[PDB]
Design a protein around this nucleic acid. Structure first.
Lengths: 21, 138, 22, 12, 431
RNA sequence: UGACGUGCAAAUCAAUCGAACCAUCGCAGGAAGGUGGCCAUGGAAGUCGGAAUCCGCUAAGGAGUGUGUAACAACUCACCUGCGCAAUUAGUAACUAUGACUUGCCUCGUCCGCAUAAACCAAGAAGACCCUCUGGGGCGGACCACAGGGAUAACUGGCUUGUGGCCAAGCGUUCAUAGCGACUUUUUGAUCCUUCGAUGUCGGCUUGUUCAGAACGUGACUGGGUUUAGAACAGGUUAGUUUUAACGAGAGG
RNA sequence: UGCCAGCGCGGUAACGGCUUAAUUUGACUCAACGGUGCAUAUGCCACCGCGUCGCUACGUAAAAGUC
RNA sequence: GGGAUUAGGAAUCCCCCA
RNA sequence: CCUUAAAAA
């Protein structure tokens, strides 16, 4: 059950910053 | 006094030697004229043309124009009508048989240098000289 | 959070480059 | 492809 | 075709008899009608001359001029169209035979074409313009390269003549082209290559004919750069490549470019005459360099060398005061011939032989230059003429008397009757 | 044509418009006489050329096969014997030539004007080019959009070598071959075989130039020539995002 | 010597027409159809008026030019 | 080209997307 | 419409 988090990138594209416990 | 072997250089039908032979031949030592003068008229007036050979013996530090013919061209001599030919006249093919007395009567001067058998040779050899006639004695 | 892309960008630029000199 | 925004269902 | 050359000698005799002729007053009338020009216009201008002659402040001279005009008019009528190699007419009323004077007209069609007009009704015939024709001038084929075909023209002293002309499509600049303009450059190089091929081969068909040069020119002439790649190519010419003169730029191009190419070819022709002079004399210098002695100079030994085997290269300057006057007695008791050096010409001692003291009488003038001209072919080798204009030529004149030649081999001085006959009867062998 | 260039940013240091958006519808010896044959040739007497090519002697010798001499001479061979989730800017003047007169094709013109975490599993991309009876199409007989095709061109490569390149009449003073010589893909055409859901195309590292082999070496460097929109063209000139891991005579030497 | 060389002078006293060995010769609007009438029986031997372009030379000069 | 007019000539009068 | 360069104060 990894936590989900988002991050901004080029041209407004969103990519994952999910944790890996 | 001085004497030397002959060179027999002539090769012309012309009279009085060259076109003006009388003057160039003189040397610094000098020389006395003889056969080069009037004597040529004896040859030109009787044995004209046919490039007759001339021995140069020089018996006395002077020119000596011998008039005797060798052969070959002698066969042409047997004709009564030789009034020149100028030049470039289609090589003028002048011919017309030959006298029946072509034998020893004409060949008598030819005996000096021929050797071998007489009747079987020297009289017969002259027959081949007459290639120019193209008709033979027949 | 979800939109996508869409724009000339830098990649779109070559495509622009290729059609330039036929 | 449905058109819209906000909802994640868009682009399906 | 030697008979045509005999006719040329007849033309020379006509030039001599013509130039020798003279007449009092302006009554004499020279005339020269140019090729590719109507006779009728010349008849009109001649009619204007007849109108000019209508009023003259003289009696006999008026009738003489008018009579010469009627003579050239009646003579002109026989022709209906312009003759090949132009037309050359002379008319007058020359005096001969101890002042006897008679009307005379002289007509002939020249072997060598001339392209000039010359009307001048004054005293003495003006045949000098024809003297250039007397020389055996080489044809001067000129190629005029252009980006739109080429002009295979010619030159002959004054007579320009275009043997051939054409035009061709040109691949030219690649232009805006495409991503592969270089292949267009390849087709360009290909069409240029075929232009190097079929055109120059056509020139091989139209100049060299059959392993014998017909032209001494082959001058390049192009506003475009093709001439630069013409001389600089394997496809160009065999042997003929050395015959090239000099590049000739043409600002206008075309036939006008050929026209500028005319006079420019004349000056570069002066240049190659300079190289030809320096070479023709320079080989003689190379003969001088040898200790073998295969050379001759002066009026002395050279004549005896002419009496024997022909000199490998005869070399004689134009002007020459010495004259071959014959020494033949009226009684013909002593034929004689000798060269007359100017000191002998002043002394005249040779005319009076000590043997009799009689003076030989003159028969007819026999100039030494014409004496070369009379039968140089009969003497063997080939006649040659050198100018003093070259710096080496003045050295040939002052340093050698202006006469000499290259012997085929060494010759010894005559000595004693035996060697003297060895040389002289040998001269008879060569005669 | 900087830095960044899956960035700080869908342009930094109603995001859509050449018709908006939303829903609906071998060696030695002899090789010679008549005669240096005739003729031509400045001369050529085996050996420049043309014709002719016959025989005395004899164990041999040709009107001479090959060198040589200007030519002879000479040496040999045929034969003979022995070892915020705008945004690339017609005819003619008295020399000749000429001619009163009657943005440029050629072109590099010289010193009467053709035509004023993610991507990915090379990448992102169903080519905005070409094309949708025809050995591609047109002829002959580019403000553009979409669905497809190597069934149908242009880059390279393959096949083909037409193209291009690499025996001896004669030249070479004499003498054919000292030296020259007539009668492979580094070029190109042709083929469409491979590639249209893509193999980034040239040159370089005075004209942009080649010129004056290694996908036509090299762009996960330059934008100069080409070069989409500004001022239909193998008609010109300008400004235009290039992405991501001794000898010789001497002269000379 | 005879517009050549030279010093204003020097230019022999400083029926038409082809043809033809010859077709003798004089005579060009009216005023034509042995050499010299431009030395005079003889010597010498003034209306038919008065810039452009192309050659040469330094706009001019130098030419018989073409309008 | 030959006559006529003029002193003699012109003139006039006679017979293709990379 | 024009007028020898082919020769006098």
């Amino acid at each position: 059950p990894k936590m989900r988090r988002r991050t901004y990138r080029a041209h407004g594209r969103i990519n994952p910053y999910m944790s890996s416990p | 006094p001085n004497e030397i072997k002959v060179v027999y250089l002539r090769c012309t039908g012309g009279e009085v030697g060259a076109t003006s032979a009388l003057a160039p031949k003189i040397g610094p030592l000098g020389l006395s004229p003889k056969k080069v003068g009037d004597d040529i008229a004896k040859a030109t007036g009787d044995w004209k043309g046919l490039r007759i050979t001339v021995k140069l013996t020089i018996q006395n530090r002077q020119a000596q124009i011998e008039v005797v013919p060798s052969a070959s061209a002698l066969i042409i001599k047997a004709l009564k009508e030789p009034p020149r030919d100028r030049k470039k006249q289609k090589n003028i093919k002048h011919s017309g048989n030959i006298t029946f007395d072509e034998i020893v009567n004409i060949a008598r001067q030819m005996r000096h240098r021929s050797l071998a058998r007489e009747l079987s040779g020297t009289i017969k050899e002259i027959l081949g000289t007459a290639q120019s006639v193209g008709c033979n004695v027949d | 959070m979800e939109p996508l892309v869409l724009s000339a960008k830098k990649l779109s630029s070559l495509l622009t480059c290729k059609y330039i000199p036929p | 492809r449905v058109r819209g925004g906000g909802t994640h269902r868009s682009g399906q | 075709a030697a008979d045509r050359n005999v006719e040329i000698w007849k033309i020379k005799k006509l030039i001599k008899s013509l130039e020798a002729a003279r007449g009092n007053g302006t009554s004499m009338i020279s005339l020269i009608i140019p090729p590719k020009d109507q006779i009728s216009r010349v008849a009109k201008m001649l009619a204007d001359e007849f109108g000019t002659a209508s009023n003259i402040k003289s009696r006999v001279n008026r009738l003489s001029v008018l009579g010469a005009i009627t003579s050239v008019q009646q003579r002109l009528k026989l022709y209906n169209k312009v003759p090949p190699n132009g037309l050359v007419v002379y008319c007058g009323t020359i005096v001969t035979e101890e002042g006897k004077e008679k009307k005379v007209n002289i007509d002939f069609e020249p072997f060598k074409p001339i392209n000039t007009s010359l009307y001048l009704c004054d005293n003495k015939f003006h045949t000098e313009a024809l003297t250039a024709l007397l020389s055996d001038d080489s044809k001067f084929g000129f190629i005029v390269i252009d980006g739109s075909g080429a002009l295979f023209g010619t030159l002959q002293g004054n007579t320009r003549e275009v043997l051939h002309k054409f035009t061709v499509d040109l691949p030219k600049k690649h232009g805006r082209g495409g991503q592969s303009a270089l292949r267009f450059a390849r087709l360009r190089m290909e069409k240029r290559h075929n232009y190097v091929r079929k055109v120059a081969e056509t020139a091989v068909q139209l100049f060299i004919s059959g392993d014998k040069v017909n032209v001494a020119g082959l001058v390049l002439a192009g506003s475009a750069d093709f001439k630069t790649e013409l001389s600089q190519s394997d496809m160009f010419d065999q042997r003929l490549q050395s015959k090239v003169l000099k590049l000739v730029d043409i600002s206008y191009g075309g036939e006008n470019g050929f026209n500028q190419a005319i006079e420019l070819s004349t000056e570069v022709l002066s240049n190659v005459k300079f190289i030809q002079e320096k070479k023709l004399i320079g080989r003689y210098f190379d003969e001088i360099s040898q200790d073998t002695g295969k050379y001759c100079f002066g009026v002395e030994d050279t004549l005896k060398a002419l009496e024997m085997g022909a000199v490998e290269i005869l070399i004689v300057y134009e002007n020459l005061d010495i004259m071959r006057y014959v020494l033949h007695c009226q009684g013909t008791e002593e034929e004689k011939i000798l060269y007359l050096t100017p000191e002998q010409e002043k002394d005249k001692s040779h005319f009076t032989d000590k043997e009799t003291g009689q003076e030989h009488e003159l028969i007819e003038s026999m100039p030494l230059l014409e004496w070369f001209a009379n039968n140089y072919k009969k003497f063997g080798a080939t006649l040659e003429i050198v100018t003093d204009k070259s710096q080496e030529g003045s050295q040939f004149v002052k340093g050698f008397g202006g006469i000499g030649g290259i012997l085929r081999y060494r010759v010894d001085f005559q000595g004693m009757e035996y060697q003297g006959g060895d040389d002289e009867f040998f001269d008879l062998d060569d005669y």
